[PDB]
């Protein structure tokens, strides 16, 4: 989730963005610097 402050300047993290928070597909792709890997991940999510 993006609180809309300065958190998008910090390196993405799967645990705090997609597990502690609800993340968007783009937010997850920001972590897996590979699109296909993100899709895979999303099938679970």
């Amino acid at each position, epitope marked *: 989730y993006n609180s809309g402050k*300065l958190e998008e*300047f910090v390196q993405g993290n799967l645990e705090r963005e997609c597990m502690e928070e609800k993340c968007s597909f783009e937010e997850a792709r920001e972590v897996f610097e590979n699109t296909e890997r993100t899709t895979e991940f999303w099938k679970q999510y």
Partner: antibody
Framework: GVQLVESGGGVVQPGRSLRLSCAAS????????MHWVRQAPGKGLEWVAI????????YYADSVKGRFTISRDNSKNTLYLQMNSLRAEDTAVYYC?????????????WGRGTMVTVSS | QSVLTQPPSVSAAPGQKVTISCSGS????????VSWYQQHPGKAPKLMIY???KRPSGVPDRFSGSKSGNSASLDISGLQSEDEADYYC???????????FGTGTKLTVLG
């Protein structure tokens, strides 16, 4: 350990241009966002800019919007502050600062600044 | 703007306690975490407290923080000579989209 050293400071005429450098070491420079903070003689701290860990995004204080440019070279582990159209108000010690790994709002490590005197 | 008001000076004897207030507004303190920085005369600023009351490793337990409304406080107990320095609070401002530093407070350990 986390080391940050600013370079490029000195006297410069108003309306001129100067580039500051910040050599970083002791950490994976690429995974961290960086800040620039300055302090005029006998004054308080003043935020200047911030750049994302990868160089993508960046914000500026209205005081330097349009004149200064913040950049970095993640292969050389260096941070840059390109100052143009310098003024007298830019006279100050310029500090390089690292943002915490999970919070840009936190500057966990600073370096000793570099003095910048803008005078004719 | 930089508003974030702080008392220009606070002091107490070695071993006593002191508290430094950081008065801001909703745009900053009200909705953002406050960090505190220590600055000795000719040294690089140092992070003492972040996210209102979190202490980095290394920072003495005698340093603690608090927040209430649009104000934040840095509390220092058992003052030691090395605590004498300038302190600055800091918070992001949603409205200005800028990181603000308080006006600064000089903490002197009475000698």
């Amino acid at each position: 350990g986390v080391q940050l050293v600013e370079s490029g400071g000195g006297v410069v005429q108003p309306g001129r241009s100067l580039r500051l450098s910040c050599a970083a070491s002791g950490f994976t420079f690429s995974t961290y966002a960086m800040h620039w903070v300055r302090q005029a003689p006998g004054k308080g701290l003043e935020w200047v800019a911030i750049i994302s860990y990868d160089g993508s995004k960046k914000y500026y204080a209205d005081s330097v919007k349009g004149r200064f440019t913040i950049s970095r070279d993640n292969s050389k582990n260096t941070l840059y502050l390109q100052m143009n159209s310098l003024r007298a108000e830019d006279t100050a010690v310029y500090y390089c600062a690292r943002a915490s790994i999970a919070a840009a709002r936190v500057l966990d490590y600073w370096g000793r600044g570099t003095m910048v005197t803008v005078s004719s | 703007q930089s508003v974030l008001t702080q008392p220009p000076s606070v002091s107490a004897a070695p071993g006593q306690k002191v508290t430094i207030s950081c008065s801001g507004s909703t745009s900053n303190i009200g909705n953002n975490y406050v960090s505190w920085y220590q600055q000795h005369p000719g040294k690089a600023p140092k992070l003492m407290i972040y996210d209102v009351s979190k202490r980095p490793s290394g920072v003495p337990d005698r340093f603690s923080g608090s927040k209430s409304g649009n104000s934040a406080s840095l509390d220092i107990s058992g003052l030691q000579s090395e605590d004498e320095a300038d302190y600055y609070c800091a918070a992001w401002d949603d409205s200005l989209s800028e990181f603000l530093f308080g006006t600064g407070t000089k903490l002197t350990v009475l000698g």
